[PDB]
Design a protein around this nucleic acid. Structure first.
Length: 217
RNA sequence: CCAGGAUGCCUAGUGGCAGCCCCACAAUAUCCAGGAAGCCCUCUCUGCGGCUUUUCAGAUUAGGUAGUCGAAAAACCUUUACCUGCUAC
């Protein structure tokens, strides 16, 4: 049971978009969820927490469940998904889906000197959500994920192997903290370096190129 | 709770089948505006609700606190107010 809406989805189904890298390059929206799955088979989905959450009513209260989910692998991709529904499993599923939709790349750079493969962040990057500022400072090697538990988990999911944090403001608003972390991660690709001064060609997108295969008949 | 005594226009009425034969409408004042039962009240013929109580309890309820109700001897004519009770795959 597949069947896509979204030109992009159709393209993916056809098999002309190879990896999510291309998508990232052409900042293409992924409203459908299955595409991500197709691209990346190694999605580890981990539920961070579930707040019960209550609207107050003329009689009693409306218990729903704000399930927070973090999704990753070890390649340099993460997703953060928040949903609040009444059935818990359903809510969790929704959260997972959201995370998948989000899934966003991470620029993993070098501590200091290249030598081996990169598993820290490139630059000192930070995020913000409400009153949580998660600041991720790049570590040295072997020094680990120095972070709040949730944050650490997120880092692990991403495939950041070593990193320092400085989570400030009310970190115990766990969801908020997670969001902040995600934002910070995103900011990695966005922070210009002297490595990317050099000018790129601007490639044509798959949406432009494979336009006949995309869209309905 | 009470009633009219008389200075008077009253007026021998006007209406509706006046006709005597019933209906309704028309006669200022009134001088008194006065009498009877009840009348602020205090001792009696010396009443039944107080005085404490001690016994308990009915209970009052979701639980409890403080009061209140019921059966036994001594002068005097409310069953309510208020505290304390519950959470994820």
């Amino acid at each position: 049971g597949w069947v896509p809406v979204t030109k992009l989805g159709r393209l993916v189904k056809a098999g002309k978009i190879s990896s999510i890298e291309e998508i990232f390059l052409h900042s293409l929206p992924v409203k459908e969820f299955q595409i991500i799955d197709q691209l990346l088979p190694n999605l580890k989905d981990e539920v961070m927490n579930i707040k019960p959450v209550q609207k107050q009513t003329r009689a009693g209260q409306r218990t729903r469940f704000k399930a927070v989910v973090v999704v990753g692998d070890s390649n340099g991709h993460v997703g953060l998904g928040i949903k609040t529904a009444k059935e818990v499993a359903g809510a969790i599923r929704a959260g997972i889906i959201i995370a998948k939709l989000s899934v966003i790349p991470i620029r993993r750079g070098y501590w200091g000197t290249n030598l081996g493969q990169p598993h820290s962040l490139a630059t000192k990057t930070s995020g913000k959500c409400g009153s949580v500022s998660v600041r991720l400072i790049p570590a040295p090697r072997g020094s680990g994920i120095v972070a709040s538990p949730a944050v650490k988990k997120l880092m692990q999911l991403a495939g950041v192997e070593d990193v320092y944090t400085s989570s400030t403001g009310s970190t115990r608003t766990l969801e908020n903290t997670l969001k902040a972390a995600f934002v910070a991660i995103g900011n990695t690709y966005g922070f210009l370096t002297p490595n990317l001064w050099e000018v790129q060609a601007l490639t044509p997108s798959p949406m432009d190129v494979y336009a006949d295969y995309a869209t309905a008949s």
